[PDB]
């Protein structure tokens, strides 16, 4: 059904968006990790 | 055609998902890189 498939496509994109959001959170923490090493190198 | 477009949307999301999977693999290796520098700083 075109209506069922349209809803399936919507939910698939929703899940892809959630995957991107998780990647975004990971990148925010990678920044923290890089800063930490650089700050550990400067403070000791 | 609505059927042709539904199939096009499906393949577009499939390719977006493959792009996210490549980004996920990159993030896994960024972790390795950060650990390496931190482990190189600790071991020498």
């Amino acid at each position: 059904q075109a209506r069922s498939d349209i809803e399936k496509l919507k939910e698939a994109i929703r899940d892809t968006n959630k995957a991107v959001q998780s990647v975004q959170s990971s990148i925010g923490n990678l920044i923290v990790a890089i800063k930490s090493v650089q700050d550990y190198v400067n403070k000791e | 055609q609505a059927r042709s477009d539904i199939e096009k949307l499906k393949e577009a999301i499939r390719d977006t998902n493959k792009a996210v999977q490549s980004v996920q693999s990159s993030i896994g290796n960024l972790i390795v890189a950060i650990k390496s520098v931190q482990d190189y700083v600790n071991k020498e």
Binding site: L9, E11, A12, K18, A19, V20, S36, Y40 | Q24, I31
Partner: peptide
Amino acid sequence: DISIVLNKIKSQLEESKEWIRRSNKILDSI
């Protein structure tokens, strides 16, 4: 300190991979 941060990234990466698995399974059913 940094070890905890890297573990968070690993967990968030695992969640991301699972969301893509679900998206692809939905696509397979179209």
